[PDB]
Design a protein around this ligand. Structure first.
Ligand SMILES: CC(=O)N[C@@H]1[C@@H](O[C@@H]2O[C@H](CO)[C@H](O)[C@H](O[C@]3(C(=O)O)C[C@H](O)[C@@H](NC(C)=O)[C@H]([C@H](O)[C@H](O)CO)O3)[C@H]2O)[C@@H](O)[C@@H](CO)O[C@H]1O
Length: 407
């Protein structure tokens, strides 16, 4: 409910300001970059004395702090598991207030009563699902009740709760600056809001969704997915695998460098149906995939395997196919699929480049012959389309595909 909003930090015509009506002073110092297109984020780094600093000084209010909520979008790169301690958003003055910091895989909200007494709650990201760092946009919501609980949500899901110690002096200043605690990282923020009440589960999820274009598909880091751009296409079940080729088949190989994404072939997404005013990829767009291998441009498309892999299964491969083959055998309908853990998409086989769905793109290990195979079948982990009878796979995580920018 926006009637409780008492701070609203936003980029408006390339100027950070408070749009809430309470007109807090916003000062910008040093290397702060503002994004002129959505989501209109500001960017800070950790290097230099000219490091980047946003000071928000609230105006005449702090008379409304028995319950409050803090909400914002944030992205950190490269947020590695051994990250040193950093304060990033600080509102502490004379040893009381609150603070937001990061260390290792933790983001920590600290409610500071005195120099001696101090409570914190945190979100610790799942390292097993983020081998290359948690470098994706996420939505933080912190709700505090001075006579109740102190909670943190991430992407609208509750993570950590603590009872507040019942007896605090709040600072009028909020300072966005990446300050190390006695290699270089970047930080993006947008839509930093403070509410003068304790938001509940329902309001937080309404808020969460209201700040996104739900039908704009996202890349792995949460930025808008785009046509005519090189990506690494990776399946959620097999994040430790890169795309390769054998014969006319696409095969997935195990990564040598698991702490980043720089292996295998790159795909470019090509629009067939969609909005031409921009380059963004949207749900119900129909599209196809190109990839460049040994300087020859191929396109992804179905092919007949050496043997039947299973009922209703057809493998997806890299073929030198003319546009009419792409239409019949390699056109897809994309739908966004965002989870707490990842920004992904589902891909349905298009009937002749229409929005009519014939199957779903999944993945699996199958034993058959590719390339120069002759005498024996071999196990290959391949992208595979389940035709017609794919109802059980709709909820399956094997149909969740992500796209990591390959610059
Ligand atoms: C049937 C069964 O329970 N088998 C057990 C194994 O289950 C498979 O485990 C492998 C891991 O080695 C995979 O996780 C596989 O899951 C998927 C997958 O590959 O991601 C889900 C996909 O939906 C499915 N694809 C399609 C198109 O349906 C594939 C696919 O069926 C296979 O890849 C084809 O070979 O499978 C699990 O099914 C696993 O628990 C092992 C561990 O011991 O135990 C087997 O008993």
């Amino acid at each position: 409910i926006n009637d409780s909003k008492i701070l609203s930090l936003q980029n408006k015509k390339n100027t950070l300001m408070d749009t809430s009506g309470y007109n807090a002073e916003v000062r910008v110092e040093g290397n702060v970059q503002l994004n002129p297109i959505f989501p209109f984020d500001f960017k800070l780094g950790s290097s230099g004395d000219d490091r980047g600093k946003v000071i928000v000084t609230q105006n005449e209010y702090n008379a409304m702090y028995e319950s409050f909520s803090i909400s914002f979008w944030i992205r950190i790169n490269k947020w590695v598991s051994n990250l040193p301690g950093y304060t990033i958003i600080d509102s502490v003055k004379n040893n009381s207030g609150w603070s937001i910091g990061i260390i290792s895989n933790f983001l920590v909200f600290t409610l500071k009563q005195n120099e001696n007494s101090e409570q914190d709650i945190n979100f610790s990201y799942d390292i097993s699902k983020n081998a290359a760092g948690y470098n994706k946009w996420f939505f933080v919501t912190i709700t505090t009740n001075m006579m109740g609980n102190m909670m943190i949500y991430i992407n609208g899901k509750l993570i950590d709760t603590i009872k507040v110690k019942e007896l605090i002096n709040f600072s009028k200043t909020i300072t966005f600056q990446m300050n190390k605690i006695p290699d270089n990282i970047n930080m993006w923020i947008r839509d930093f809001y403070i509410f003068a009440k304790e938001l509940d589960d329902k309001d937080i999820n309404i808020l969460f969704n209201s700040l996104q274009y739900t039908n704009v598909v996202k890349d792995y880091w949460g930025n808008d997915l785009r046509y005519d751009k090189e990506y690494y296409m990776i399946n959620v079940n097999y994040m430790n695998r890169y795309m390769s080729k054998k014969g006319n088949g696409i095969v997935f190989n195990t990564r040598k460098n698991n702490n980043d994404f720089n292996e295998g072939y790159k795909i470019i997404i090509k629009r067939i149906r969609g909005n031409t005013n921009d380059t963004r990829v949207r749900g119900e767009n129909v599209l196809y995939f190109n990839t460049t291998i040994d300087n020859k441009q191929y396109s992804l498309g179905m092919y007949k395997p050496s043997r039947n892999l299973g009922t209703d299964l057809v493998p997806l491969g890299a073929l030198d196919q003319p546009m009419d083959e792409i239409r019949k055998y390699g056109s897809f309908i994309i739908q966004p699929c965002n989870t707490f853990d990842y920004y992904a998409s589902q891909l349905f086989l298009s009937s002749n480049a229409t929005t009519n769905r014939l199957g779903i793109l999944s993945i699996g290990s199958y034993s058959f012959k590719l390339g120069d195979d002759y005498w024996f079948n071999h196990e290959y982990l391949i992208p595979v389309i389940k035709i017609e009878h794919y109802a059980s796979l709709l909820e399956s995580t094997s149909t969740h595909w992500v796209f990591v920018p390959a610059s």
